[PDB]
Design a binder for these strands. Structure first.
Ligand SMILES: [Mg+2]
Ligand SMILES: [Mg+2]
Ligand SMILES: [Mg+2]
Ligand SMILES: [Mg+2]
Ligand SMILES: [Mg+2]
Ligand SMILES: [Mg+2]
Ligand SMILES: [Mg+2]
Ligand SMILES: [Mg+2]
Ligand SMILES: [Mg+2]
Ligand SMILES: [Mg+2]
Ligand SMILES: [Mg+2]
Ligand SMILES: [Mg+2]
Ligand SMILES: [Mg+2]
Ligand SMILES: [Mg+2]
Ligand SMILES: [Mg+2]
Ligand SMILES: [Mg+2]
Ligand SMILES: [Mg+2]
Ligand SMILES: [Mg+2]
Ligand SMILES: [Zn+2]
Ligand SMILES: [Zn+2]
Lengths: 62, 101, 212, 136, 25, 91, 80, 97
RNA sequence: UUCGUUAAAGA
RNA sequence: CGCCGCUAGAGGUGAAAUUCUUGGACCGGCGCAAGACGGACCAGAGCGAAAGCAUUUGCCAAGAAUGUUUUCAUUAAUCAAGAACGAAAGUCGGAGGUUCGAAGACGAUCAGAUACCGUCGUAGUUCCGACCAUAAACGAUGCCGACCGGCGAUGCGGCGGCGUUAUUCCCAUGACCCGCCGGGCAGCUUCCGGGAAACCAAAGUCUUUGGGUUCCGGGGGGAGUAUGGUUGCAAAGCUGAAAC
């Protein structure tokens, strides 16, 4: 059960019923340049290292 | 014999065991359906008028076609007189009295 | 209990001259009591695609196999049918074309009888403005008769060796494409399905003849 | 146990059926024949909630359990057969398989070619809904 | 009220009055 | 003159045994009392013998027919199936 | 303002057979030289039936909807 | 008055069209009236294509597809964001890019 | 996913 | 339903439950039996008088259109009465019954459901014989004939074009490109004109009012109702008021 870390490359947009989470396609530090999209609530910039508890998900955009 | 005819052959007056000169499907307007032949263990399924699929031998015989006189129960007897003459022709099967009465 | 520790492995041997004979490995329960280990193995089948039998041919045009018997920890299989993949069959079905179908029963040289199919899609020519590309349906009936007729005199006197040697490079489809252009330029005619429905006898001698 | 193959380098193949539905997700590992089931973990075997057994999280947990059992029983490669409720229901697969393919490709389980062997009817047999069909 | 079900209830009333006529001719 | 408008041949009975039963007996009484065209002599002399038996008047060729008609539709279907299985691939 | 009284002959040819003024027939009579010995046979252009030569008994014109297609390309003339 | 000239469907020469069932609500709609589209989807999400390509047996020798006749009705398609309402001058248009 | 009804005029 | 293997859940929903499950459900592989159904090919495409019609092959007759220096010579158009078909549902017999499913029984949500949702299921939905003759049976637009703009396409024939591709090769048919003709389903623009407008190449050629003919409307309800008559096994259909 690994717990990995990831720094933000780009910011796609904001999502939620309250408009609170931010769909972030972050990147993978510990592996090669692969792509998953994560829902992050709270303020975030480009370069923020993020704590990931499960690197198996993928959020969708609209 | 049923081993000669192909499957789906509508026949009548067939035999249970080979050599009893015609037992199954002998009433008027009835037939059987021959299916499911076997190369080894010479058996043949026949669909009877009751709907049962009986496995029989492949050496017993059957006349090809249906029994003439089909539709005999289409006419209502329409009076007690024709039923009296019918049962007087057949046998004394008619003291039909209600068991409650 | 752990039944998979008790279960046995038989590897699958394809019949001769695909290119190779290795297919895979299957599980056997064991030989115990009435249930012999060769009971279900006589009835097991396989549905294996290409690019592992014909040395980098097209990935579609799958093949149906059935295990005939077992011979020294090696379960030997034999031809049972030939299909195509669902994505390739659903592809090349255009809304502005015509899909001509055919099917025919035929008996081989030996006692194997098979029902083989045929699909043919009409073709838009190069430098064509009319986007419809239909036919007068008499050419469609004529080409149904033609594609029903061609397969009869291929698979009339040809047993499993020659019909597999014809269905590997799609020589039937190329022959229909050659005899097809006089009627209409039909695009990518295939067979799409064929299955064995009559098997005469075990014939281990004919199986050894199939090997060589 | 060593398993079927000694001195690895040749892939041991198995057929992995993925039955994706709107209410559940099946992942199933069989040999190349189609009879001997190797492993079978559904969505309800991993998620207690009945409303969340169709979830991609349920599909990933079932896929990780299936991949762990397949690594313990000693197979390497999987030919994936995707299917859905295609008789009269929606022919498109559910939301679980789209992440279950990722969950199989993550933890071992080298994927061969993938085919959509879905049961498709010939000529659109009688639908469960009715004249005016499902409402609300 | 729909004209369809108005005509059907007047049809049922016609059937009821017809059965009343057949009951007391 | 058209003396009966609905009962037809069944007017020999009268008022008894129901309109639906008399209507269902009417068609088969017409079928059993109508003369049929003989397929052998070409005449229309098929006289009704007992049930199952039909008899043409000329040339005395007795035929085993239906119970109330000359040919049952099921019997024609059986005859078509028997000739089809006859000429199907020579047994 | 179209000259209906004196139209163009190309226009009168491109118009329909009966819709135009004179209603001239599009058919003709052609003289097929049969290659048997010498014979030249007159035949209608839109021939509906077969044409058999009385000398060599060969088919001259095939029955075809429209106008009759021919055999090997024997010559013919337009006589009006 | 008549809102359209086509009266919804495309039946102009014939008199009856055999109905085909809908996908969501499963309602019988004639096929010249129902929203009949053809979805072409890759079976793998575009972020998992790289994962399956790295974990594949072959070195990119298979690319499967998914072709589905999607068949909605006009009662569910407006609710499901396909055939949104337009203007009177905008109803004379063709397929969108 | 559930969420009914508000008399009559009087501009 | 018959076998083989794994195993604790498999349905179904917004959520659960009614249902099946260590007697093995669901799942995968093989086969058997049943009946319904003809997708993708299927289109502002075709045919039929409409209702309607889509797997392959054979047989039976019928027909639109076209090519007709072919035939008869006004044989024609519309139609009171009358007659033939006529979706679905329903009714009466015989056969069978896979799915769906009127009614019905439950499980849910709501103040309450007997309703929309889910599970099972009767008549029916299937075939061959008889009846009923109704629909938003719609083009909400009678039939025949003539005239009055254009454009690009499509289905079927016919015609013209040392163009291209198809056999063996000049000789004929096939597939594509350009144009014309006839009738057919249609599309776009328009100040041709109409109409209250929507809109319409017909709903135009209508106060500048007349080509031939049939059926129907006279404010809205009562009411397609009662009473008559007539048809039907029945449900019901046709004709059809008045008082207020
Ligand atoms: Mg009794
Ligand atoms: Mg008694
Ligand atoms: Mg007493
Ligand atoms: Mg409105
Ligand atoms: Mg209609
Ligand atoms: Mg109240
Ligand atoms: Mg129980
Ligand atoms: Mg099963
Ligand atoms: Mg009906
Ligand atoms: Mg009875
Ligand atoms: Mg019945
Ligand atoms: Mg219900
Ligand atoms: Mg049900
Ligand atoms: Mg009832
Ligand atoms: Mg009416
Ligand atoms: Mg009329
Ligand atoms: Mg043409
Ligand atoms: Mg030609
Ligand atoms: Zn006689
Ligand atoms: Zn819908």
């Amino acid at each position: 059960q690994p717990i990995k870390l990831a720094r933000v490359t780009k910011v796609l947009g904001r999502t939620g019923s309250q408009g609170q989470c931010t769909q972030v396609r972050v990147e993978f530090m510990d592996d090669t340049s692969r792509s998953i999209i994560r829902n992050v609530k709270g303020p975030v910039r480009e370069g923020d290292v993020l704590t990931l508890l499960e690197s198996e998900r993928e959020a969708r955009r609209l | 014999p049923v081993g000669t005819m192909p499957e789906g052959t509508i026949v009548c007056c067939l035999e249970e065991k080979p050599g009893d000169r015609g037992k199954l499907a002998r009433a008027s307007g009835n037939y059987a359906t021959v299916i499911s032949h076997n190369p080894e263990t010479k058996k043949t399924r026949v669909k009877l008028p009751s709907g049962s699929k009986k496995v029989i031998s492949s050496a017993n015989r059957a006349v090809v076609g249906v029994v003439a006189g089909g539709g005999r129960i289409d006419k209502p007897i329409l009076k007690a007189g024709r039923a009296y003459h019918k049962y007087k022709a057949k046998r004394n099967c008619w003291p039909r009295v209600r068991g409650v009465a | 209990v752990d039944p998979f520790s008790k279960k046995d492995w038989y590897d699958v041997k394809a019949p001769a001259m695909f290119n190779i004979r290795n297919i895979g490995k299957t599980l056997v329960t064991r030989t115990q009591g009435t249930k012999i280990a060769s009971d279900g193995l006589k009835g097991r089948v396989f549905e294996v695609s290409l690019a592992d039998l014909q040395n980098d041919e097209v990935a579609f045009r799958k093949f149906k196999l059935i295990t005939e018997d077992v011979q020294g920890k090696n379960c030997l299989t034999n031809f049972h049918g030939m299909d195509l993949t669902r994505d390739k069959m659903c592809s090349m079905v255009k809304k502005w074309q015509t899909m001509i179908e055919a099917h025919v029963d035929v008996k081989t040289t030996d006692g194997y009888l098979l029902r083989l199919f045929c699909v043919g899609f009409t073709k838009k020519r190069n430098n064509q403005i009319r986007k419809t590309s239909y036919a007068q349906h008499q050419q469609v009936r004529q080409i149904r008769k033609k594609m029903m007729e061609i397969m009869t005199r291929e698979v009339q006197t040809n047993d499993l060796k020659e019909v597999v040697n014809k269905l590997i490079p799609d020589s039937i489809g190329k022959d229909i494409e050659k005899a097809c252009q006089s009627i209409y330029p039909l695009h990518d005619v295939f067979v799409r399905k064929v299955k064995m429905l009559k098997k005469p006898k075990f014939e281990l001698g004919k199986l050894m003849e199939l090997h060589g | 146990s060593l398993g079927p193959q000694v001195a690895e380098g040749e892939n041991v193949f198995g057929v992995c059926h993925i039955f994706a539905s709107f209410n559940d997700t099946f992942v199933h590992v069989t040999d190349l024949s189609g009879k001997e089931t190797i492993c079978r973990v559904t969505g309800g075997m991993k998620v207690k909630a009945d409303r969340d057994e169709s979830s991609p999280y349920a599909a990933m947990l079932a896929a990780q359990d299936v991949a762990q059992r397949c690594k313990e029983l000693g197979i390497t490669a999987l030919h994936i057969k995707l299917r859905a409720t295609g008789g009269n229901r929606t022919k498109t697969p559910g939301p679980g398989a789209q992440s279950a393919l990722r969950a199989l490709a993550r933890s071992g389980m080298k994927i061969g070619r993938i085919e959509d062997v879905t049961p498709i009817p010939s000529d659109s047999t009688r639908r469960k809904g009715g004249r005016r069909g499902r409402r609300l | 009220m729909r004209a369809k079900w108005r005509k059907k209830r007047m049809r049922r009333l016609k059937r009821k009055r017809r059965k009343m006529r057949q009951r007391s001719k | 003159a058209k003396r009966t408008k609905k009962v037809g041949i069944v007017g020999k009975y009268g008022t008894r045994y129901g309109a639906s039963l008399r209507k269902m007996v009417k068609k088969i009484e017409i079928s059993q009392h109508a003369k049929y065209t003989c397929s052998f002599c070409g005449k229309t002399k098929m006289k009704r013998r007992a049930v199952g038996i039909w008899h043409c008047g000329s040339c005395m060729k007795t035929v085993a027919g239906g119970a109330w008609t000359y040919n049952t539709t099921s019997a024609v279907t059986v005859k078509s199936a028997i000739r089809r299985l006859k000429e199907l691939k020579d047994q | 303002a179209k000259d209906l009284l004196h139209p163009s002959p190309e226009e009168e040819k491109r118009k329909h057979k009966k819709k135009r003024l004179v209603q001239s027939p599009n058919s003709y009579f052609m003289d097929v030289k049969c290659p048997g010995c010498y014979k030249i046979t007159t035949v209608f252009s839109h021939a509906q039936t077969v044409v058999l030569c009385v000398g060599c008994s060969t088919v001259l014109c095939q029955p075809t909807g429209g106008k009759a297609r021919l055999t090997e390309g024997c010559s013919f003339r337009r006589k009006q | 008055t008549k809102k359209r000239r086509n009266n919804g469907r495309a039946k102009k020469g014939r008199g009856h069209v055999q109905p085909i069932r809908c996908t969501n609500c499963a309602r019988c709609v004639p096929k010249d009236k129902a929203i009949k589209k053809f979805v072409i989807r890759n079976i793998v999400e575009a972020a998992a294509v790289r994962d399956i390509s790295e974990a594949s047996v072959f070195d990119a020798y298979v690319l499967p597809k998914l072709y589905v006749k999607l068949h909605y009705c006009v009662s569910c398609a407006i609710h499901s964001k396909v055939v949104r309402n337009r203007s009177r001058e905008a109803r004379k248009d063709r397929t969108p890019p």
